[PDB]
Amino acid sequence: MGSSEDQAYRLLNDYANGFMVSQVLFAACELGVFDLLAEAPGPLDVAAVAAGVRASAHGTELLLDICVSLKLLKVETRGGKAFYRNTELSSDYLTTVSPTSQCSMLKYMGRTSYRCWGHLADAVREGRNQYLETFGVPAEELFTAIYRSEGERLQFMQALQEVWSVNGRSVLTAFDLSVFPLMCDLGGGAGALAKECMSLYPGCKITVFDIPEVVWTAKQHFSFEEQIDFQEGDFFKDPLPEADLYILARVLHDWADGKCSHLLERIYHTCKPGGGILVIESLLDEDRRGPLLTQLYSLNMLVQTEGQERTPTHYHMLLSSAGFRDFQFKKTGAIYDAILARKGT
Amino acid sequence: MGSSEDQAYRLLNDYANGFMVSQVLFAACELGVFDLLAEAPGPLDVAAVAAGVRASAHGTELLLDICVSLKLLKVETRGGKAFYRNTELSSDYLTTVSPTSQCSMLKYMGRTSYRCWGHLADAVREGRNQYLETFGVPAEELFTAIYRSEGERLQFMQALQEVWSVNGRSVLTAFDLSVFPLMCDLGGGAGALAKECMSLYPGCKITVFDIPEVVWTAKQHFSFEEQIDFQEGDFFKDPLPEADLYILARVLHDWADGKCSHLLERIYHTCKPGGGILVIESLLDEDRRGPLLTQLYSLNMLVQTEGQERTPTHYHMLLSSAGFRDFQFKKTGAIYDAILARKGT
Ligand SMILES: C[S@@+](CC[C@H](N)C(=O)[O-])C[C@H]1O[C@@H](n2cnc3c(N)ncnc32)[C@H](O)[C@@H]1O
Ligand SMILES: C[S@@+](CC[C@H](N)C(=O)[O-])C[C@H]1O[C@@H](n2cnc3c(N)ncnc32)[C@H](O)[C@@H]1O
Ligand SMILES: CC(=O)NCCc1c[nH]c2ccc(O)cc12
Ligand SMILES: CC(=O)NCCc1c[nH]c2ccc(O)cc12
Ligand SMILES: [Zn+2]
Ligand SMILES: [Zn+2]
């Protein structure tokens, strides 16, 4: 990718070099270079950043300089010295104090997904995930592999909640959910989406439903409101909480059609006339050929779960088969879209 | 990176998702999807590609669809079926038969560099490479870690030669080398650059100098011309071949200043009045803040070797200290640039 070379060659190098750019961003997060800059009295030199993050003078310099070129950081010259500062981008998304922080998700991508992706050819060859070949941990029970340790589980929970600080409003306000006074977030993790949901619908109440170890770490690590309640269990076998609306955010994409049909049938059979199901997923274009981000997300499900990303028609087949009617969707213009279907008589 | 969201958020996801895009390209190469399409009588459906590469129908489909979105492949509809074909880009750079093939380099990046990069935070913290923490192999002798096995050595040799099919002419014709009838490529690997050099300068002769195991695999795996000769040895201790011009392509970037000064002093002391040194490296902008590709390449030297990328001034310091004069450089507009310096009286 030399300035004077063929557009195709330049594009090819961009693609090839993508993993280096991803890891510069992940490493900057992992070392906390953005937080140190936000906690600083002004801009910092290379020696200061290096000292404050316990890293090399040579290593730090290179990292800061790439961040500047990537427009993650800004640099100013004072005397014979470069001083670094945050951008609008890093302040809004790469600072732990920021409410729209994307830090934890980026750290998970670099420590977890990145490794899995190193075995992509094999996942493509086998049509299955690579936890065993990557971490030496079996995935016969998906979430035993995903929650490898207490540490891994917390990181996963901190990671996933972050998108809702930017995407939450569009998915919950796509349809008017004020018709469902009592709600249940099936596989709600730490309860970030339910916390968002409760501020938008003040006349509602919600129960966050997840596996016992998740419910425990949620109560133990994430602070709590008056409208949010918890229930531990397995949604494939246990009695589900009574609700007018069951929310399924990034649950269906973890599983194959059959497993999906099973959970959907259980929810249907628990619903009452007029009850609803709100599926929050990144919708794939009808020709499965876009959006590129969603396509990459489907391949990550090949590598990280037992599922895939799906087209609106595919969700309609699944939901119709379970017994739901009045299927509707809304493309938000964001990663995450919203589907609402209902139970009749 | 939803179409309707903030430019900064979209850019952040691009960066974050870069490793997925890199591995889609590496995996496509590793499975030989481009070669199968070039060897096909026409365009192929998903079932055909899947069968021809021994992979999943689901896995293959996703890979082909991402390649189409990345503009690596083109798709056409016939009946109720997608048929895939190569682009100008994949035909020129991703086909093993093509002379400008970049396949081997991409395979090395995905199998070798990609893994090393997973330990970037640590390389930045320690200021040293990660062969031990990645492959469990010590790097106290750099090239013993780089040539982990017979297999790894061949892959490295096939990988590195590829850039010269696009960049070779600019580096060898930057200066008129017809003044040096007898040449030596120090650390010339398989001899791709020397083969390029011999077609450009028909009145010249060249000796490719590398470590015994490299010289062996070069004679054993790469086919040979009448102007090219080989010499095995260690350029830090052994008698160098007699030449009017010593070529150092991507050698100096592997080592620290001191080691560089040592080899440079040896070459200087072997040269005769009017003799020359041709350093072929990716030059860093004077403020070390670009080009981005070169910056990423310097960080890869932190992770993969004992060196870094350097600015023209830095090469001038090194070459002047060794005794060379008449320092000149030429930015080609490509990844690889050229430096020429001379020995006086
Ligand atoms: C992909 S995460 C999504 C979390 C959250 N809804 C979001 O989008 O951020 C899937 C959730 O389903 C939970 N889960 C998986 N299997 C479950 C089961 N059998 N019963 C209850 N919860 C389960 C996991 O613990 C995890 O919180
Ligand atoms: C980065 S590779 C570059 C190969 C080639 N010049 C190119 O740019 O494609 C560095 C070369 O130096 C060789 N090398 C490393 N140490 C050496 C030594 N002490 N003596 C001779 N060759 C050496 C390696 O075997 C390798 O071929
Ligand atoms: C890249 C991507 O798939 N992001 C979505 C969030 C995410 C990352 N890893 C996961 C594993 C399971 C899951 O249900 C969601 C995620
Ligand atoms: C990404 C990059 O640094 N490309 C340059 C070619 C290349 C890849 N790995 C290497 C290790 C040592 C070296 O001397 C050159 C390379
Ligand atoms: Zn039923
Ligand atoms: Zn000397």
Residue whose structure tokens are 């998700």: A105
Residue whose structure tokens are 């791709």: B192
CA of B124, closest CA in chain A: separation in Å?
4
Measuring CA to CA, which residue among A243, A295, A285 is closest to residue A268? A243
A300 known member of a binding site: yes
Q: A44 with A53: CB under 8 angstroms?
A: no
What CATH number does residue A303 fall under? Answer: 3.40.50.150
Closest Cα to atom 4, ligand 3: which residue? A297
Q: A74 with A85: CB under 8 angstroms?
A: yes
- Strand order through the sheet with A276-281: A228-232, A205-210, A182-186, A245-249, A276-281, A337-342, A325-330
What CATH number does residue B36 fall under? Answer: 1.10.10.10
Q: Which helix (H) or strand (E) holds B26?
A: helix B7-31
Instruction: Assess A28–B contact: CB distance below 8 Å, yes or no.
Output: no
Distance CA B318, CA B3 (A): 50
Judge if A52 and A13 occupy the same domain: yes
Surface-to-core class of residue B126, CB atoms within 10 Å of its CB (0-12 exposed, 13-18 middle, 19+ buried)? middle
Instruction: Assess A10–B contact: CB distance below 8 Å, yes or no.
Output: no
Instruction: Assess A91–B contact: CB distance below 8 Å, yes or no.
Output: no
* Resolution of the experimental structure, in angstroms: 2.7
Our answer to whether residue A269 is catalytic in this structure is no
Q: Largest Cα–Cα distance in chain A?
A: 77
Surface-to-core class of residue B111, CB atoms within 10 Å of its CB (0-12 exposed, 13-18 middle, 19+ buried)? middle
Catalytic member of A253, A269, A314, A316: A253
Please tell me the distance between residue A254's alpha carbon and the centre of ligand 3 in angstroms: 9
Give the other-Cβ count within 10 Å of A82's Cβ: 19
Domain boundary among B71, B94, B117: B94
Give the other-Cβ count within 10 Å of A222's Cβ: 16
Positive or negative CA dihedral for A259, A260, A265, A271? positive
Distance CA B155, CA B108 (A): 7
Structure determination method: X-ray
Question: Are residues B124 and A1, on separate chains, in Cβ contact within 8 Å?
Answer: no
Closest Cα to atom 5, ligand 1: which residue? A188
Residue spans of beta strands (DSSP E) within chain A: 44-45, 73-78, 81-86, 182-186, 205-210, 228-232, 245-249, 276-281, 325-330, 337-342
DSSP single-letter state for residue A122: H
Q: Which helix (H) or strand (E) holds B228?
A: strand B228-232
Distance CA A315, CA B182 (A): 70
Distance CA B268, CA B276 (A): 9
- List, chain by chain if needed, residues with CB within 6 Å of any ligand 4 atom: B 113, 160, 250, 253-254, 297, 300, 304-305
Judge if A115 and A87 occupy the same domain: no
Instruction: Assess B298–A contact: CB distance below 8 Å, yes or no.
Output: yes
Q: Which helix (H) or strand (E) holds A16?
A: helix A7-31
Which two structure tokens, joined as six digits, stand for B249?
């392509």
Domain boundary among A72, A94, A116: A94
Give SS3 for B34.
helix
Question: Are residues B65 and A124, on separate chains, in Cβ contact within 8 Å?
Answer: no
What are the start-end ranges of the H helices in B162-223?
Answer: 164-173, 192-200, 212-221
Distance CA A70, CA A26 (A): 13
Judge if B29 and B63 occupy the same domain: yes
DSSP single-letter state for residue B240: P
A147 known member of a binding site: yes
Judge if A28 and A162 occupy the same domain: no
User: Which residues lie closer than 8 Å to A103 by C-beta, 6 or more apart?
Assistant: A29, A34, A93, A94, A95, A96, A162
Distance CA A142, CA B279 (A): 53
Distance CA A252, CA A259 (A): 9
Judge if B109 and B255 occupy the same domain: yes
| Residues in chain A after which the chain is broken, C→N over 2.5 Å | 224
Domain boundary among A41, A73, A94: A94
Judge if B8 and B145 occupy the same domain: no
What's the half-sphere exposure (Cβ side, CA atoms, 13 Å) at A84?
Answer: 29
Judge if B59 and B107 occupy the same domain: no
Give the count of Cβ contacts less than 8 A between chain A and B: 250
Residue spans of beta strands (DSSP E) within B146-192: 182-186
H, E, C per residue of A130-181: CHHHHHCCCCCCHHHHHCCCHHHHHHHHHHHHCCHHHHHHHHHHCCCHHHCC
Distance CA B272, CA B72 (A): 50
Judge if A78 and A177 occupy the same domain: no
Judge if A285 and A270 occupy the same domain: yes
Distance CA B302, CA A256 (A): 42
Q: Which helix (H) or strand (E) holds B279?
A: strand B276-281
Question: Are residues A295 and B11, on separate chains, in Cβ contact within 8 Å?
Answer: no
Domain that holds residue A41: 1-94
Q: How many domains does chain A have?
A: 2
Judge if B103 and B186 occupy the same domain: yes
DSSP A311-341: -HHHHHHHHHHHT-EEEEEE--SSS-EEEEE
Which two structure tokens, joined as six digits, stand for B322?
């060794």
**CA-nearest residue of chain A to B7?**
A89
Judge if B102 and B89 occupy the same domain: no
Q: Largest Cα–Cα distance in chain B?
A: 77
Q: What's the one-letter identity of residue A42?
A: G
Distance CA A282, CA A331 (A): 9
CA of A66, closest CA in chain B: separation in Å?
7
Measuring CA to CA, which residue among B256, B259, B254, B258 is closest to residue B297? B254
Residues of B acting as catalytic residues = 253
Judge if B102 and B33 occupy the same domain: no
Distance CA A162, CA A95 (A): 12
